[PDB]
Design a binder for this molecule. Structure first.
Ligand SMILES: [Cl-]
Ligand SMILES: [Cl-]
Ligand SMILES: [Cl-]
Ligand SMILES: [Cl-]
Ligand code: NA
Length: 221
């Protein structure tokens, strides 16, 4: 596999978004993975609608602003036949009436692929060969809230009890040796002001730190 990957440098990733006071990170993680796969298929980068997922995917087991899961969002897009653009179905950060319009759909998927749980090497292969990957993580720490630079490593992090969905856009390493001081490049949904332009470097191959490889998946387009 490549020594490093960064799908932002290839046009696969939209500018950083902000979920605000709504527990919809699972929806931003799912739209980020679908934006990359639609870009790989068509060559067009189009921002997708988190609000469409928040308002319409309760039957699949999501709970809008009270939480949800990326696989359930990809299941909804498959059963639904489509997903509207961010432009046509804007984000308001509260649970609202489902206003899905097929004529405004700009994306589709046939289901999703799961990365084997807990396998950082399996996540590395998916990121190198597919594009950005949806992942769950333990983000419940002040050290994450105030992250700004460096490789994030928190002793209090759990690899099994997770509470936040994010998007792995690549991986890399510090220095000249590609085999040490490794990190995952992660896009968050707390706005560009959070973290480093809305991103964080999370320690890689340090025993599945913060659970990044515990529940990873991507849509099949
Ligand atoms: Cl459940
Ligand atoms: Cl999931
Ligand atoms: Cl840094
Ligand atoms: Cl940057
Ligand atoms: Na920084």
């Amino acid at each position: 596999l490549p020594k490093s990957v960064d799908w932002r440098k290839k046009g696969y990733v939209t500018p950083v978004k902000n979920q605000k006071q709504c527990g919809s990170a699972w929806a931003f993680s799912a739209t980020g993975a679908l934006e990359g796969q639609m870009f790989r298929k068509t060559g067009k980068l189009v921002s997708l609608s988190e609000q469409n997922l928040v308002d319409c995917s309760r039957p699949q087991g999501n709970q809008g602003c009270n939480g949800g899961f990326m696989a359930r969002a990809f299941q909804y897009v498959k059963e639904n036949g489509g997903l509207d653009s961010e432009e046509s179905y804007p984000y308001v950060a509260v649970d609202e009436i489902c206003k899905y319009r097929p004529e405004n759909s700009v994306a589709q998927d046939t289901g999703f692929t799961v990365v084997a749980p807990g396998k950082e090497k399996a996540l590395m292969k998916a990121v190198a060969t597919v594009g950005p990957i949806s992942v769950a993580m333990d983000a419940g720490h002040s050290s994450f809230q105030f992250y700004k630079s460096g490789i994030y490593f928190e002793p209090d992090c759990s690899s099994k009890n997770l509470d936040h969905g994010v998007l792995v856009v690549g991986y890399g390493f510090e220095g000249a040796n590609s085999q040490n001081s490794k990190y995952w490049l992660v896009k968050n949904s707390w706005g560009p002001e959070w973290g480093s332009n809305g991103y964080v470097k999370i320690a890689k191959d340090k025993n599945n730190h913060c659970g990044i490889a515990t529940a990873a998946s991507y849509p099949n387009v």
